[PDB]
Amino acid sequence: XTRPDQXXXX
């Protein structure tokens, strides 16, 4: 959820 740009990141 932390990093949409990185494909999620939780």
Side-chain angles (χ1 to χ4, degrees):
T2 73
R3 295 293 298 266
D5 63 328
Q6 298 183 311

